[PDB]
Homo-oligomer: A and B are copies of this chain.
Amino acid sequence: ATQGVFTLPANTRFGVTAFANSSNTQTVNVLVNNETAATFSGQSTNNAVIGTQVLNSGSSGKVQVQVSVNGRPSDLVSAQVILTNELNFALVGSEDGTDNDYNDAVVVINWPLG
């Protein structure tokens, strides 16, 4: 199944933050309406924040997280969770290797802000 794709309310500001847990340098691209809106990269085996930004979901509401290492797309896992019918988390993990820890790049999207 498709992973790392989320439908947000239109024209809504959301937060996106990425962490790294890998010997490989991670590249995280955040797409809004199929176009790269933010790119984060870095390397850490200690959950270092490799990027954070506030973006706008625009008129499509379509937000996609892609993770790549040495040009090769990582395998993604994702889900959305809503707390008290108000607070949204869109969560992404990724695997770049063979140990299947799925934490090599971790991405957290949250809304609403403000």
How many whole Å from A55's CB to the nearest CB in chain B?
A: 10
Q: Are A101 and B86 in contact (CB under 8 A)?
A: yes
Q: How many copies does the complex hold?
A: 4
* Residue from B7, B21, B82, B113 in contact with A79 in the complex, judged by beta carbons closer than 8 Å: B82
Nearest CB on B from A7, distance (A): 6
Q: Complex: how many Å from CA A77 to CA B87? A: 9
Q: In A77-110, which residues have CB < 8 Å from any B CB?
A: 77-87, 89, 91, 93, 95, 100-103, 106, 108, 110
Chain B residues whose CB sits within 8 angstroms of the CB of A95 once the complex forms: 1
What are 15 pairs between A and B in contact, CB < 8 Å?
A1-B77, A2-B84, A5-B85, A15-B47, A17-B19, A45-B113, A47-B113, A49-B49, A49-B52, A81-B91, A82-B82, A84-B100, A86-B100, A87-B93, A103-B113
